[PDB]
Amino acid sequence: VIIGKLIPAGTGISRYRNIQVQPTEEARAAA
Amino acid sequence: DLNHAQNIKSAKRMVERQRPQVWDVLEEVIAEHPVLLNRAPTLHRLGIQAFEPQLVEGKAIQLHPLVCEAFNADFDGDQMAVHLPLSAEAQAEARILMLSSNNILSPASGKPLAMPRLDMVTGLYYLTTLVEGATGEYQAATKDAPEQGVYSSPAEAIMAMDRGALSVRAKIKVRLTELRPPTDLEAQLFENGWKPGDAWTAETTLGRVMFNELLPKSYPFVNEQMHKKVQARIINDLAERFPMIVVAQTVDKLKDAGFYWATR
Amino acid sequence: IVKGENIPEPGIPESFKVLLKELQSLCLNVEVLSSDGAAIEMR
Amino acid sequence: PFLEHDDANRALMGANMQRQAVPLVRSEAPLVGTGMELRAAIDAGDVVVADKTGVIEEVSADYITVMADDGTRQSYRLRKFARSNHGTCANQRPIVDAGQRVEAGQVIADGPCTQNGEMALGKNLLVAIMPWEGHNYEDAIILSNRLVEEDVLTSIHIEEHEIDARDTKLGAEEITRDIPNVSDEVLADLDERGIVRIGAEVRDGDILVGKVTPKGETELTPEERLLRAIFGEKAREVRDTSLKVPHGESGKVIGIRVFSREDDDELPAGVNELVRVYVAQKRKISDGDKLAGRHGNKGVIGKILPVEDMPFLPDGTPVDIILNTHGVPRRMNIGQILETHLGWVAKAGWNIDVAAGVPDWASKLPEELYSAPADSTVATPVFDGAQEGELAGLLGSTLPNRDGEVMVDADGKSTLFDGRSGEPFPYPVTVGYMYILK
Amino acid sequence: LISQRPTLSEETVAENRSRFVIEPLEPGFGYTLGNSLRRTLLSSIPGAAVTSIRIDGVLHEFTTVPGVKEDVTDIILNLKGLVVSSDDDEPVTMYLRKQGPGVVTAGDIVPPAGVTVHNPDMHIATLNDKGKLEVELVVERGRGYVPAVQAEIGRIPVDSIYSPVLKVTYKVEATRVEQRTDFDKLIIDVETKNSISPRDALASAGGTLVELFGLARELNADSEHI
Amino acid sequence: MLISQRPTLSEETVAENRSRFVIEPLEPGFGYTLGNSLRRTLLSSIPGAAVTSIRIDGVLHEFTTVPGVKEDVTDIILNLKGLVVSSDDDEPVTMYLRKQGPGVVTAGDIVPPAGVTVHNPDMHIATLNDKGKLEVELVVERGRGYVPAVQNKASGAEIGRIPVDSIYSPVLKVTYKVEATRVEQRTDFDKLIIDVETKNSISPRDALASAGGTLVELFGL
């Protein structure tokens, strides 16, 4: 908080912030 | 974007002079854009909750009466602060983490906080209370007289309430086609294939009937006078058996009915 | 917001940088360090 | 009033909030009050008192003169729209006519919060103590739109702005109407000197006094210097530092004070000219404003309803204000319920109408209190005032509104008609007149 | 004076239930005509319904049935759901009589005069084995709802639901203006008996009101509005 | 058991300003909701004439006194609010008021233009003395309801013009009560009387008809 970084809790945890979001190959086709 | 202003400096001048064209625009930008509300002192996290903004008139902030318990906000010159989440993550955390209708139970005891209070409690209490010797009272007369205390449906009982024939707090017997009986009565009175949309007659106050119309159609009939503790029971029970949206909307309906009968 | 683009990644709060200087003024040598252990110029 | 019936907590609050009231334009006196109403006003000093028994010679909104038995004239100049230290209106108004005969120590003109010599910190409003559809909930309040239309809770507020033109190191500040880069319209309300003209309006961001200060070295932008060459507007040698109106503030200009160095005015070293603009505004009672009674009860205005849809008596007389029931019992300020009953008694009048003699309750009542016409004022000193037995009896003695019909029963309730649906309210609702303050 | 652009739209919930909206209205007309509409729908429309009944075998004994599954009280409230549009304008006695084990319905009753029963599939009672049932029905048109009105022995007066609208509920929202303070928006929810459809009931209500307020219009009729 | 009888209009005169009305016969329960449905429209929608803005030569704003007069300007404006005025002129007309010398300035001293009339001349406006002279023109417009003073910014109004709150409400006080006939379960009928009072701008029959005619227009299929 003092240095302005993401707090290591909630949405600041590594497993949550490094998520990769892409549409499924099936989804992109149907458009 | 719209051709109302050619450049930014025209737009800024436009807003500062409160040009009438900006109002309909503001509704479009405010739509589904959450805002955080907060009242000092902030004792717990529920002291900050996200809401959907509604353009209202005057210079006061209209606050939902249920969140008063969480904010400890009484309406005597009380002021609250507004914060505008900007980034996509900020708006996501507001809509998901800090949404008002998603935070009902106090994260200290698990008890419901948006549960109705003073005004709505007395309203629902009066609505479901049972008066002996009320207008329209069922007596089940026997000798040379029929029962004459039953009604074709809750709708007929309402037509009897508008006329001077029925009292909202009377012991009566009616048949309900859209409500579900209690556990014991559902088991025996109903062949165990299901118990929806099938007529069954129970004896409760018309108020208690209109009360159970506020609860989910899937919820059993309660048939009690609503002390505040009884209300905590049902909402606690609703959190276990139903999603939050069902609870949020049900408590909303409890607010409308609680206030209406609070004045009456 | 005006250009309608995504909102940028935040920087270093000026309050923090002011804090580092206030510690230096107390004869306290504070150094921000990366994994390498190399000092980083706060500017 | 009824101090002996309120807990020290809410009483302490009630005392603190009386000094928080604001002067209304109408300044109506309290219908149910105590003795101190009179003496507190005259001793405060905001009321014009005649120091010699005489007769009025002239009555003007500006001043009033009185000729005494000595033949010597005394004259009193009236404060008209003087701005108090906190922005409240200190207007004075005369209460005497031309030929009236006055006595030494009498009241000639009313102050801001006084009427006929006694402090009037609020107004008398018709109150209903029913909860009303949640709009009055958790100390909130709902009012009749009548209070807006009839300016009963309207109060004038004045503000004082100030800007000075001094001698800087680069040059002397000049109050002027010539501003570097502005439309002629934003100046359309300014005079030659550059100050806003009297009686002119002001919207947030508008200009009160045009002031300019030297700027150098310029070192303008290469991008900017070209636009200066194209449109032929010479880059002015000075920076615009003008006095504008603060955000949200609005109103009209009452007066302007100007102190100039050219004229032999006294100024601090380096200061040439001083100009002060006084702006006032009418404040209709609005949503969110804070109202309160003398018993420590307080709350914001949650909603203002049209007079059409408001709980109203069988008279068709709509109630001015609706107060929630749930906040009354818990706080031990039930003295507010007493003055509510007495409030209705005072505005309706009464006549004890003894069958044979004073009914057993009125054993201690003074004879002057037996009869009373409508709109009479009442005084109940704190620790020896009205008592319960006398109140019910006075509640039993009441007068028809216009027709023979009586509007309030012996326990102080009436059947109100829902203005929205039209059907009456099931249970008799307590109504009365309560003195509340802005 | 003349104002602009009020409309009326309807969303059908089911063949028997229709929801209506009025947009927009000037404050505070919502509550003004709101409760008057619902009240008009309830107790104004002419309709036919049952007034009194008498069944053979029903006598001094309070309420029991010689050969059906449910008590006489249950049958009374079953019969109260009978929807019959009549053209007789006066009490007419219908005829229903069945024998043998089976289920009696609305179709088991012959329509005497001006009567066209609109819910033939309506259940009335399930007959015992080798069971018979004889009963008369007094049907007379009317308005709204009149409780059971009470020479004859075995005559059972029943609560009579004359109007075709069973329940109507309303509330007023506020939206749809640029700089205005949330103009009123009227919502009304009416459930119909199948004798008539909802919008005809609404159209009839409006016709009743406009004719009822022409009472004051016919007085002077000079000063007016939009 | 329909009873067929056209709802009647009986009219009564309780006074010059107000006149009672009674309607019968009506179905049970209609008396209350219908009378109030008229009441709400009476108070809100009855068109009338109200003074929009006024001008006094000497004053530039409403927060100053006038030499010789006993009332300040904003006090005079509050006294001018009580004016009950009727203007058949669709467009804005400007009345005038000029008086001087010691005496009392009533509402009758106002000279109405062509087509308008003042219905309460006895109203005290101001009281003047020898040195006091009062000149004021008043702009009368037509409308309905209560409109707050239109700021001279929204219009192109002059700096001398003083906008004033406008109250177009010819109706003063309105109520109702029901005499309900609920006999021995035979022919229950509702009888409802309304008590309509006006400000003498228009008679109760004319206001009620205006509201009634307006109600007819809104109720539509």
Next chain:
Amino acid sequence: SAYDTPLGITNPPIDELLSRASSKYALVIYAAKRARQINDYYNQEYVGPLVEPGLQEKPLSIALREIHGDLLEHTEG
């Protein structure tokens, strides 16, 4: 089964969305990351919108309805 028609922000239900990810915080990043994606596409990661978007739908709201329909994975690192 019916709860009721939800209004604005409360649609879609949080419960039906939580079935699509591990935690509420994951759900936040999901919609956030995808919300930036859609906006980048409007002013050309560039894909979608996969669902038919009602005019002016905040790309955050579009990304939420996408997650409701299982239209995207949804891998945790």
Next chain:
Amino acid sequence: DIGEAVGIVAAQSIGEPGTQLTGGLPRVQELFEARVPRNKAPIADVAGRVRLEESDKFFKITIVPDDGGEEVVYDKLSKRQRLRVIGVLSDGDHVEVGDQLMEGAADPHEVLRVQGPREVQIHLVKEVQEVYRAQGVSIHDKHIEVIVRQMLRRVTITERAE
């Protein structure tokens, strides 16, 4: 959920009450701060019989262990500070290891060395929960446990795991 910051949630769940606390905030601070109790109460050092002797308006409690080994005596105790209730403790009663001998507050350090760390946390949660419940506040034990967990994290020769 995984990311939940329960430490702050606990500190606030315990912090929001206290405006309702009027045997109050002083006692709560004494417990979390782990100070020597305001009026110290003795705990049994071993299980066995109890011999209650009364000095000159004093209370002298001796424990005859079931070993039976060296007796355990408690020399001087104010008679004005009443004994614990089972009724009140009397001569001949049987006492277990961690029992509270007199009414009052057990020194959390003393119960620590006697019953071990696992029980100190239980004693503190009880005492704290006794206060908030006495005033009527409903707080779940886990919040207090989160706070108390942070008190026994270190051992004298430093953090436990490290």
